[PDB]
Amino acid sequence: AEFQSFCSSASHSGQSVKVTGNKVGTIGGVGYELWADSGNNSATFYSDGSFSCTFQNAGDYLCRSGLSFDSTKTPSQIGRMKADFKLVKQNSSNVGYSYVGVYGWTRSPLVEYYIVDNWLSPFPPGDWVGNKKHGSFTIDGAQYTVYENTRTGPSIDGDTTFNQYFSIRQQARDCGTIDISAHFDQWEKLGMTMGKLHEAKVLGEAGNVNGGASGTADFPYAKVYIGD
């Protein structure tokens, strides 16, 4: 079969919570965060992991759901991780950059990481995402372009500087399983060391360096797990 079964059945279920300010929390046993630097935004998070996002006049907006860790263990110490997701795009405007897929951070080193399978922008993110283009790699059965960057901005530690790691899928995917640890393995081969893990979540991010981006997106399936 070409696609995962959840691609045919995904539906929001469980209890939910709507958030409209910057907020980290849990719903059931699912970690969530809504964060934006600006704008009039929201997200709805469900206890089955699924979620939905709205953003208005935002410079950088992130909606994300999944795993929250305590920054004590590397990914290899934690175990092999995966994310199942389904994205349904809706209208947006003035989206200068966007990432959909898996996201998180490490500490020691401080890293913001992305596995990007789709985007809410009109075109995929380009070479501007980082100063170092490692090139094309077969990761998790598909072609990804791998980049690294050093960025200054808000972080889990406060305003500072951090590395960024990116895998950008060469052809968009709107439903499937991201083998997160397979990306981490590739990154380690390229000198992109993972520190102690802070989180691993399904993400929708949209922003504009000058604009405020506006729009909405739906994630009728989103599950991050330590397992096969």
Active site residue 205: yes
Catalytic residue among 33, 112, 148, 199: 112
Active site residue 199: no
Catalytic residue among 33, 148, 199, 205: 205
Whether 119 and 92 have beta carbons less than 8 Å apart is answered as no
Q: What's the per-residue H, E or C state across the chain? A: CCCCCHHHHCCCCCCEEEECCCEEEEECCEEEEEEECCCCCEEEEECCCCEEEEEEEECEEEEEEEEECCCCCCHHHHCCEEEEEEEEEEEEECCCEEEEEEEEEEECCCEEEEEEEECCCCCCCCHHHCCEEEEEEEECCEEEEEEEEEEEECCECECEEEEEEEEEECCCCCEEEEEHHHHHHHHHHCCCCCCEECEEEEEEEEECCCCCEEEEEEEEEEEEEECC
> With 0-12 CB in 10 A as exposed, 13-18 as middle and 19+ as buried, what is 152?
exposed
The CA distance from 167 to 64, in Å, is 18
Residues forming the active site: 112, 205
